[PDB]
Amino acid sequence: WEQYRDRVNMLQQERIRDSPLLQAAKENDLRLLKILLLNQSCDFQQRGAVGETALHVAALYDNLEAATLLMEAAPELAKEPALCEPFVGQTALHIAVMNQNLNLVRALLARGASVSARATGAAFRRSPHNLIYYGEHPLSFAACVGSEEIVRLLIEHGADIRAQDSLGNTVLHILILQPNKTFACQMYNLLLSYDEHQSLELVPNHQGLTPFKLAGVEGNTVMFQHLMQKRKHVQWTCGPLTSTLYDLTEIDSWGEELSFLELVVSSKKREARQILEQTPVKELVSFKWKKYGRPYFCVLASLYILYMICFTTCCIYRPLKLRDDNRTDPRDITILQQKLLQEAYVTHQDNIRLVGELVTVTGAVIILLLEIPDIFRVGASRYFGQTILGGPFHVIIITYASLVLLTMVMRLTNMNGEVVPLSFALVLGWCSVMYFARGFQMLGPFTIMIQKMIFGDLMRFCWLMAVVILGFASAFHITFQTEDPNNLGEFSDYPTALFSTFELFLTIIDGPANYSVDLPFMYCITYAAFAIIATLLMLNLFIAMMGDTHWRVAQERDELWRAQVVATTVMLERKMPRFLWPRSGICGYEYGLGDRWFLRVENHHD
Amino acid sequence: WEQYRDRVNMLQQERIRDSPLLQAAKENDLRLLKILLLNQSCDFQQRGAVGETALHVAALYDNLEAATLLMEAAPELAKEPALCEPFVGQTALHIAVMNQNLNLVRALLARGASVSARATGAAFRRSPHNLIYYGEHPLSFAACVGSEEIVRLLIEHGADIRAQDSLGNTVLHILILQPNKTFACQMYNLLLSYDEHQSLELVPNHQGLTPFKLAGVEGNTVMFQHLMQKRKHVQWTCGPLTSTLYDLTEIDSWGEELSFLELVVSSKKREARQILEQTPVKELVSFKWKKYGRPYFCVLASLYILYMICFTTCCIYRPLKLRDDNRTDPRDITILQQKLLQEAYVTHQDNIRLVGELVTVTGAVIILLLEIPDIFRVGASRYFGQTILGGPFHVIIITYASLVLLTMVMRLTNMNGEVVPLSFALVLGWCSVMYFARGFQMLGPFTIMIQKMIFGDLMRFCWLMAVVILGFASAFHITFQTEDPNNLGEFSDYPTALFSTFELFLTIIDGPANYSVDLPFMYCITYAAFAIIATLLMLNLFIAMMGDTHWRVAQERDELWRAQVVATTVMLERKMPRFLWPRSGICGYEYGLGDRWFLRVENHHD
């Protein structure tokens, strides 16, 4: 996995140094090559540990002289690849192209090396194990390494550009996938110059991604503005300000089931939310959010708040009657019990409760009908793990809907204990109102800052906090086992000791002090220790740690909310009917432009 | 100490200016030297205050002419050192080499100055009193001062390199010990060029440190990477990425009892935890932590958590019975007492408690058998003072094991008062679970941030806080001595007044206010003063001070946790059996490299 690559590397070096031919081709000592090569006892077709030829060893260490006497001795040595596991099809042409030796590429293609060689090795895969991902073809290698004349000479000797390696990538896809974009745009432009017969730009992956859409997913913003340089038309310029006309064919993407914006905003990269601030996309989603996004999000926020008010009002009024059995046990304060279903609804007010119960059951099942096909559409790890798409809000709204239907089953079945799913349903359903805070600048970054602290600082405080609560709760319970529980009812047994220590951690309840009786001195010692450690330091160190966290990632949650507005915009018009959402942009059929649905911007550059 | 060096410096200057010969050699007036030196009444072998010669005075002030007429008048003046306390063996050659005057070194070694002169003075020692530590030999002086030609002329005239001064250092050790490493690597390479017969690089200190290990302890990272340029082999390079093969002979150090990593991570320097981020070491301890470190640490953490759950469960269930004597005294709430040992265990449940007591006694004694030989191995100040090695966790786990054994002695002896060592044992043993938080990125830096604020800000707040508690507790107790204790039981006598003022500092209990009675007005005045000073300012200024501390040293606790993971990794495989921990690296015997156990990395440099 990683020590297997190391093992096969030491085996490769060992079979290089054991063979005199391979080690002599590595050292580039020409006279000893002629001594062992003039004699016919040596084997020219001699393999390495990975099945590599001595020509591969000569191309590995930039040994042009060793390689050209190997080709002069045997001309066929170009036309064998390595045939082992990490290099299933790697030829000497791949090594010569990657090392950027132009004379070696010329002298190796002179004898007839295959330019369509497909190196399906484990090292030439898009994997986290490999440091680079340059392709399976020599032309992809020449485009990724950044050599212009090697690309031109590969076009001159065969090597059609429309060659797809594994995961469906052509050379344009892998040119976008490289970092260090100084030479990527010129290479892309030069292979678009030779692209003369569907075009090469529309060839997808095995995932189905256009190179435009792959640049959208990968966050290659420099390549994105380079691509929209070719997809734009400057209408006019008049002094300091110009008006230009971008094309929304590959951005809006009307006819495709998977659109460009859904692949952009639901990507796992830390980038590709800064590609939503580019020159067509930012004003496109800005017009889409101001014109239709924010009023519709406010409408669904208002009806969800009214639905929560209806659910809360149907929770407050409940079928509760007086209990039948008298309480002969002290410490029991239950005076009411929930009544049976046959006696629950005979009142006009119980019918008013019943129709609202039908409303909240209908709301729960339409929440499930809206949300379970999203779990079946995009994968559940990406659906629930993305804070851009409101993944925690999705899992708590599934939990709320399942708790409401569980409450409905317990209501028809007359099971006891409806207060537990009703209280979980009220807490989670009212906390699901926080999903609609993303539509406002005042509440959005604050809400995802809350979820950021919930994931980051709350857990790392709660583990250490639970350790301190367990230790001091054990001490508090074993300081008062000998004492009377009627004077200090806290720390009576271990669950209420653990809960009381949890409350005393947070300075919620007062310190247990009965001044009319004599308390143990060990309680005072361990409560001074609990006050110094947990009350004084740990709570205020959590305040200081959240301040230190809050000043650092404020820009991150600002741009995360800026992407979250786009996620809200593209979540709508995929669910809502199309007569609520007209097609964004300027229709080109009215002006004789060929129904491409452009978008005009006007910018002041001087 | 330091005013003795000042005193001997003024005595040195006084006996320079009292002597006409020494002051004339200092001022470099040639004719007055010829006048007093042509006459035979003057003494050529005339001492200073430190026993220095006039040749030493001429070499001290760069007086080449005074020194060469002193050597022409008397040729023997090179071959005497100073013979007093701060300079026991300092010659004029040491002063001439330190002042970097090449012509005086040539004219002084022409007359036959000793190149193997060993200056065992108090000024030439590795001490905090001395500003520099350049050695006892002129070759070490020439290497530390940074002169190439003086070094070459010293090797041309005797001066073997394998000369060890005090604390076992050769010239390479003291070349590593210097700061300002611009000329240190070239000097080290130049004396490794002259090293032609064990090699010089393997000569240790009197402490036993190799110069590789001394560079590891001292934190000389530039010298560390310069040393591992010579201990590495580049296997291949193919375009943008290369694969190279570092040697782990002096890094892993299998056969030695003291290994390189233990001397690195348990050093008292503020540096040498940034030497764990170097190219071989970070990859080696990263593989050692992912492959074997983290699963074994998680297994030990889960086993210790289950052991402490067993100790907590054996603490909750206790041999407690009803008390024999009735309580005729009010304010006494003790209703249970611990029973005798002969009546403690007759139940099946008491046997289930007894076997768990045997389990936690076995756990305490194996904690002692694992931890007391560590106190006997490395010194106790370094063992308990290092937050990298978990020193506070070590002293609280010794305290927990001793408290559990004291509880066992009190249980067999039937002493009363087991609740005090049981509660200290529960608090300290559950706080020892915080040791295992260092294996996770989420909990580790937070835990050593807690320890940092405990050492730094908690003490500096608690001294000031205890001052405020003492003053306001004295005022609160002397405001209510005239009043009824049955209405406000707090501030009754001075310990409960001190404790009540302590928990009123922290806003734990409510303010004492009985509205059914008339309180003193002076209590209201001094409680307003206590609320303004302690409640309002001091607590929130402690919050502000910990925020100001927390933003500054966040990267320090990040790199301290990064060293702490390496400390955990090297703490294991020293304690655990060797079949749990196989030898890290790639064995060179399988590939014919001579059993050196290398490690291969592959890096993308372009």
Side-chain angles (χ1 to χ4, degrees):
Chain A
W1 60 88
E2 265 86 7
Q3 66 200 59
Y4 166 70
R5 299 286 196 274
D6 297 4
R7 163 156 173 81
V8 75
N9 277 301
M10 317 273 306
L11 294 174
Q12 178 180 0
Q13 295 296 320
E14 181 195 9
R15 280 75 178 272
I16 280 174
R17 65 172 157 255
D18 283 1
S19 293
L21 168 62
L22 267 73
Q23 181 57 48
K26 164 174 181 172
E27 291 300 316
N28 208 12
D29 60 357
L30 277 296
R31 44 151 305 276
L32 193 147
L33 293 174
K34 296 183 290 294
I35 284 300
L36 68 93
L37 188 63
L38 178 63
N39 200 4
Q40 295 297 109
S41 50
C42 187
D43 196 11
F44 315 119
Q45 202 73 256
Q46 189 200 163
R47 296 294 86 193
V50 298
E52 62 184 10
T53 319
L55 196 66
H56 291 48
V57 185
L60 191 44
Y61 297 99
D62 286 332
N63 291 350
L64 168 63
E65 292 90 4
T68 194
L69 281 71
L70 279 163
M71 289 189 279
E72 278 180 339
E76 74 171 1
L77 294 174
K79 293 183 286 293
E80 310 83 20
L83 73 165
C84 284
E85 175 57 47
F87 320 101
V88 182
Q90 185 196 37
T91 62
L93 190 59
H94 290 64
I95 302 154
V97 170
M98 185 180 288
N99 278 290
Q100 289 186 73
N101 200 357
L102 183 62
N103 275 301
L104 181 61
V105 166
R106 247 195 286 264
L108 183 62
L109 288 178
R111 285 67 171 172
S114 178
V115 287
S116 69
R118 184 176 177 87
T120 75
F124 319 105
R125 293 293 172 88
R126 197 200 176 179
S127 294
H129 317 145
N130 307 323
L131 273 298
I132 57 168
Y133 159 65
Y134 275 17
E136 299 180 0
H137 288 75
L139 190 152
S140 302
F141 275 25
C144 292
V145 76
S147 192
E148 295 294 329
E149 164 50 70
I150 298 179
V151 160
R152 277 186 263 255
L153 197 144
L154 276 176
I155 299 299
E156 279 171 46
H157 295 285
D160 69 316
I161 297 169
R162 286 183 175 83
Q164 306 195 42
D165 64 81
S166 180
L167 303 172
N169 297 124
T170 78
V171 185
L172 298 195
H173 301 247
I174 203 152
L175 264 178
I176 293 168
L177 281 156
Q178 299 311 304
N180 198 8
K181 274 87 69 173
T182 48
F183 51 88
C185 308
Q186 293 179 356
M187 194 73 54
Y188 204 105
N189 190 359
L190 187 152
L191 281 72
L192 285 186
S193 73
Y194 287 99
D195 178 38
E196 303 300 319
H197 302 275
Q198 194 200 49
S199 165
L200 173 70
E201 294 267 26
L202 303 160
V203 189
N205 274 9
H206 294 345
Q207 204 157 23
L209 314 182
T210 308
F212 199 87
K213 294 195 287 185
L214 189 44
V217 175
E218 288 303 311
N220 208 331
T221 60
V222 179
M223 187 65 205
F224 186 76
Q225 61 201 13
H226 181 270
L227 282 172
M228 294 300 291
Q229 277 288 131
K230 298 293 183 182
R231 277 150 198 87
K232 89 195 198 182
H233 174 230
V234 175
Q235 274 183 342
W236 49 265
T237 175
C238 197
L241 75 165
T242 182
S243 167
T244 181
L245 191 71
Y246 291 92
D247 198 6
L248 301 183
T249 304
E250 277 159 284
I251 302 177
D252 210 17
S253 73
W254 177 259
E256 313 178 57
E257 190 262 331
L258 73 165
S259 83
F260 175 77
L261 289 172
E262 307 184 19
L263 307 185
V264 161
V265 67
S266 69
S267 84
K268 281 168 207 143
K269 306 295 290 291
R270 196 258 182 195
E271 61 267 15
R273 51 159 146 81
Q274 59 204 49
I275 209 170
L276 293 172
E277 313 287 308
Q278 298 306 295
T279 317
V281 188
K282 180 175 71 176
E283 292 82 3
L284 167 68
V285 307
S286 288
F287 157 74
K288 214 175 288 189
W289 175 252
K290 298 291 180 68
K291 193 71 177 70
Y292 313 106
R294 194 203 280 116
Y296 293 172
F297 202 51
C298 283
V299 159
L300 281 71
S302 301
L303 281 71
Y304 188 76
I305 279 166
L306 284 187
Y307 161 75
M308 275 292 137
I309 287 171
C310 170
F311 172 60
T312 305
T313 314
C314 290
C315 281
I316 297 318
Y317 299 90
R318 264 199 312 165
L320 259 60
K321 73 156 175 290
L322 282 72
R323 67 179 300 168
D324 50 353
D325 45 349
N326 46 359
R327 32 177 182 164
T328 61
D329 182 35
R331 307 170 53 89
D332 176 60
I333 50 169
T334 293
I335 55 162
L336 259 60
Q337 65 181 357
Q338 62 182 359
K339 72 188 78 167
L340 301 177
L341 172 63
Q342 63 84 30
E343 68 205 277
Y345 312 92
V346 63
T347 301
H348 180 46
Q349 282 95 46
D350 291 331
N351 293 336
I352 295 171
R353 185 190 63 235
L354 171 62
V355 293
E357 284 176 357
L358 291 191
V359 168
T360 185
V361 159
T362 305
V365 301
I366 66 167
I367 275 171
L368 282 185
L369 285 182
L370 282 182
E371 286 284 323
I372 311 285
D374 295 355
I375 309 169
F376 288 158
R377 197 185 89 97
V378 56
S381 70
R382 186 177 254 171
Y383 191 59
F384 293 138
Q386 274 307 104
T387 187
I388 278 176
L389 311 171
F393 298 115
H394 294 328
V395 65
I396 69 178
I397 196 66
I398 300 299
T399 313
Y400 160 75
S402 63
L403 277 157
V404 165
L405 303 185
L406 162 73
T407 302
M408 183 278 288
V409 170
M410 293 177 70
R411 180 73 67 88
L412 291 178
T413 305
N414 274 147
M415 304 180 171
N416 290 318
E418 209 159 304
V419 64
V420 174
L422 269 189
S423 53
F424 284 127
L426 282 156
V427 167
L428 291 179
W430 268 111
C431 282
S432 307
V433 182
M434 293 180 183
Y435 178 77
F436 297 99
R438 70 196 44 207
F440 314 105
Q441 190 151 20
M442 183 179 72
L443 311 174
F446 178 51
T447 309
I448 74 188
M449 192 85 240
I450 289 158
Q451 320 300 294
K452 271 184 174 291
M453 302 286 189
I454 278 176
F455 287 15
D457 284 9
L458 188 67
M459 285 175 194
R460 84 168 44 107
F461 186 69
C462 278
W463 283 101
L464 278 296
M465 161 166 193
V467 172
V468 177
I469 287 169
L470 271 167
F472 277 101
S474 309
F476 286 154
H477 183 229
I478 320 296
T479 298
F480 284 110
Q481 266 192 338
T482 47
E483 316 298 317
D484 212 347
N486 311 318
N487 297 94
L488 282 72
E490 54 268 53
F491 323 125
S492 292
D493 56 354
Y494 196 66
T496 191
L498 194 68
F499 191 43
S500 172
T501 305
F502 166 72
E503 292 179 353
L504 285 175
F505 202 109
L506 293 163
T507 67
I508 284 171
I509 62 164
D510 276 359
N514 196 359
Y515 297 115
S516 300
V517 301
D518 279 335
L519 295 197
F521 81 108
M522 186 65 204
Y523 162 65
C524 305
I525 295 174
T526 193
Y527 199 50
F530 185 64
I532 289 300
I533 292 303
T535 295
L536 176 58
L537 187 152
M538 281 282 283
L539 206 60
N540 309 311
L541 183 53
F542 185 51
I543 301 177
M545 182 179 72
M546 278 184 312
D548 190 29
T549 300
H550 202 295
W551 84 265
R552 288 173 192 274
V553 297
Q555 185 178 2
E556 195 198 331
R557 48 97 177 163
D558 281 333
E559 61 202 11
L560 269 179
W561 173 77
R562 282 205 290 276
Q564 189 179 6
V565 167
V566 190
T568 318
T569 315
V570 71
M571 189 269 297
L572 312 167
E573 72 182 1
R574 196 192 74 228
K575 294 188 183 183
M576 294 177 71
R578 213 65 201 176
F579 78 104
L580 275 301
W581 286 81
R583 189 170 179 177
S584 58
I586 297 169
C587 176
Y589 197 109
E590 321 181 26
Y591 318 103
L593 281 180
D595 64 358
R596 271 190 280 171
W597 282 83
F598 300 93
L599 188 146
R600 190 198 73 92
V601 306
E602 190 175 3
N603 50 298
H604 179 257
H605 51 74
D606 273 334
Chain B
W1 44 99
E2 293 83 3
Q3 66 200 59
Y4 166 70
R5 298 286 196 274
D6 297 4
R7 164 156 173 81
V8 75
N9 277 301
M10 317 273 306
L11 294 174
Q12 178 180 0
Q13 294 297 319
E14 182 194 9
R15 280 75 178 272
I16 280 174
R17 64 172 157 254
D18 282 1
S19 293
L21 168 62
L22 266 72
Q23 186 56 230
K26 163 175 181 172
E27 293 302 324
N28 208 12
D29 61 357
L30 276 297
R31 43 151 305 276
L32 193 147
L33 293 174
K34 294 181 176 67
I35 284 300
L36 68 93
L37 189 63
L38 178 63
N39 200 4
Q40 295 297 109
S41 50
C42 187
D43 196 11
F44 315 119
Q45 201 71 256
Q46 182 197 162
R47 296 294 86 193
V50 298
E52 61 184 10
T53 319
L55 194 65
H56 291 48
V57 185
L60 191 44
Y61 297 99
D62 291 331
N63 291 350
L64 168 63
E65 292 90 5
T68 195
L69 281 71
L70 280 162
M71 289 189 278
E72 277 181 339
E76 74 171 1
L77 294 174
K79 294 182 286 293
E80 308 76 34
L83 73 165
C84 284
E85 175 57 47
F87 320 101
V88 182
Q90 185 196 37
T91 62
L93 190 59
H94 290 64
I95 302 153
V97 175
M98 185 179 288
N99 278 290
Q100 289 186 73
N101 186 238
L102 183 63
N103 275 300
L104 170 56
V105 167
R106 248 195 286 264
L108 183 63
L109 288 178
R111 275 69 174 174
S114 178
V115 287
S116 69
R118 184 176 177 87
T120 77
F124 319 105
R125 293 293 171 88
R126 197 199 176 178
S127 294
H129 317 146
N130 307 323
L131 273 298
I132 57 168
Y133 161 64
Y134 275 17
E136 298 179 359
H137 289 75
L139 183 62
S140 302
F141 275 25
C144 291
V145 76
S147 192
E148 298 304 17
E149 182 65 26
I150 299 178
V151 160
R152 277 186 262 256
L153 197 143
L154 275 176
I155 314 284
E156 277 170 46
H157 295 285
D160 69 316
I161 298 169
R162 287 183 175 83
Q164 307 192 48
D165 67 85
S166 181
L167 280 75
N169 296 304
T170 79
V171 184
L172 301 193
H173 301 247
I174 203 152
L175 265 176
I176 290 191
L177 282 156
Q178 298 310 306
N180 198 8
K181 274 87 69 173
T182 48
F183 60 67
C185 307
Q186 293 179 356
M187 194 76 51
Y188 204 104
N189 189 359
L190 188 153
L191 282 72
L192 281 179
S193 73
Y194 284 99
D195 178 38
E196 303 300 319
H197 302 275
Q198 194 201 49
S199 165
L200 171 70
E201 274 263 13
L202 303 161
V203 188
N205 290 24
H206 294 345
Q207 202 157 26
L209 314 182
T210 309
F212 200 87
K213 294 194 287 185
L214 188 45
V217 175
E218 288 303 311
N220 206 332
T221 60
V222 180
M223 187 65 205
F224 186 76
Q225 60 201 13
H226 176 268
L227 282 170
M228 288 280 312
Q229 297 325 282
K230 298 293 183 182
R231 277 149 199 86
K232 90 194 199 181
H233 174 230
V234 175
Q235 274 183 342
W236 49 265
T237 175
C238 197
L241 75 165
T242 182
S243 167
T244 181
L245 190 69
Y246 292 93
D247 198 6
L248 301 183
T249 305
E250 277 159 284
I251 302 178
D252 210 17
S253 73
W254 177 259
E256 313 179 57
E257 190 262 331
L258 73 165
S259 82
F260 174 77
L261 289 171
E262 311 186 18
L263 308 183
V264 161
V265 67
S266 69
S267 84
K268 281 168 207 143
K269 306 295 290 291
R270 196 258 181 195
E271 60 267 15
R273 51 159 146 80
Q274 59 204 49
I275 210 170
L276 293 172
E277 310 287 308
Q278 298 306 295
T279 315
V281 187
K282 180 175 71 176
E283 268 77 359
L284 168 68
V285 307
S286 289
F287 157 74
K288 214 175 288 189
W289 174 252
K290 301 318 189 43
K291 193 71 177 70
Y292 314 106
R294 192 203 279 116
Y296 293 172
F297 202 51
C298 284
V299 159
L300 258 66
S302 301
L303 186 64
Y304 185 75
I305 278 166
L306 283 187
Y307 156 75
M308 186 63 72
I309 282 171
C310 170
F311 181 75
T312 305
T313 314
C314 290
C315 282
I316 298 317
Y317 299 90
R318 265 199 312 165
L320 259 60
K321 74 156 175 290
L322 295 174
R323 67 178 301 168
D324 49 353
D325 45 349
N326 46 359
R327 32 178 181 164
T328 61
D329 182 35
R331 307 170 53 89
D332 176 60
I333 50 169
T334 292
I335 55 162
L336 259 60
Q337 65 181 357
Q338 62 182 359
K339 72 189 77 167
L340 300 177
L341 173 63
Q342 63 84 30
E343 50 195 343
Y345 312 92
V346 63
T347 318
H348 180 46
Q349 282 95 45
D350 291 331
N351 293 336
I352 295 171
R353 186 191 62 235
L354 171 62
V355 293
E357 284 176 356
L358 291 191
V359 168
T360 185
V361 158
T362 305
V365 301
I366 67 167
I367 275 171
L368 283 185
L369 285 182
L370 282 182
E371 285 284 323
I372 311 285
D374 295 354
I375 309 169
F376 288 158
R377 197 185 89 97
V378 55
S381 70
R382 186 177 254 171
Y383 191 59
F384 293 138
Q386 274 307 104
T387 187
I388 278 176
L389 311 171
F393 298 114
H394 294 327
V395 65
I396 69 178
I397 196 66
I398 300 299
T399 313
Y400 160 75
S402 63
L403 277 157
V404 165
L405 286 193
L406 161 75
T407 302
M408 183 278 288
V409 170
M410 293 177 70
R411 179 73 67 89
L412 291 177
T413 298
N414 274 147
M415 305 180 172
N416 290 318
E418 209 158 305
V419 64
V420 175
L422 269 190
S423 52
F424 284 128
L426 282 156
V427 167
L428 290 179
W430 268 112
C431 283
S432 306
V433 184
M434 279 198 219
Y435 177 77
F436 298 101
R438 69 196 44 207
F440 314 105
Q441 191 151 20
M442 182 179 72
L443 310 173
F446 180 49
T447 308
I448 72 189
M449 192 85 243
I450 288 158
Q451 296 294 321
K452 272 184 174 291
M453 305 268 195
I454 278 177
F455 285 19
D457 284 9
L458 190 67
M459 281 174 198
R460 85 167 44 107
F461 185 68
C462 278
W463 282 101
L464 277 296
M465 159 168 196
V467 172
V468 177
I469 293 168
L470 272 167
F472 277 101
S474 309
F476 286 154
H477 183 229
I478 320 296
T479 298
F480 284 110
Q481 266 192 338
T482 46
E483 315 298 317
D484 212 347
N486 311 318
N487 297 94
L488 282 72
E490 54 268 53
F491 323 125
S492 292
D493 56 354
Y494 196 66
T496 191
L498 194 68
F499 188 46
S500 172
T501 305
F502 163 72
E503 59 191 0
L504 278 175
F505 202 110
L506 298 151
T507 65
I508 284 171
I509 64 162
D510 283 357
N514 195 359
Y515 297 115
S516 300
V517 302
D518 279 335
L519 295 196
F521 81 108
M522 186 65 204
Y523 161 63
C524 305
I525 295 174
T526 193
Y527 199 50
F530 185 65
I532 288 300
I533 292 303
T535 295
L536 174 58
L537 188 149
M538 294 299 291
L539 206 60
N540 309 310
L541 183 55
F542 187 51
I543 301 177
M545 182 179 72
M546 275 184 321
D548 190 29
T549 302
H550 201 295
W551 85 265
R552 288 173 192 274
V553 298
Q555 63 182 357
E556 194 199 332
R557 58 88 173 173
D558 281 333
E559 61 201 11
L560 269 178
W561 173 77
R562 283 205 290 276
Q564 189 179 6
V565 167
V566 190
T568 301
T569 315
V570 71
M571 189 269 297
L572 312 167
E573 72 182 1
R574 196 192 74 228
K575 294 188 183 183
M576 294 177 71
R578 213 66 201 175
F579 78 104
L580 277 296
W581 286 81
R583 189 170 179 177
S584 58
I586 315 161
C587 176
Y589 196 95
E590 321 181 25
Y591 318 103
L593 278 177
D595 64 358
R596 271 189 280 171
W597 282 83
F598 301 94
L599 188 146
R600 190 197 73 91
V601 306
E602 190 175 3
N603 49 299
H604 179 257
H605 51 74
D606 273 335

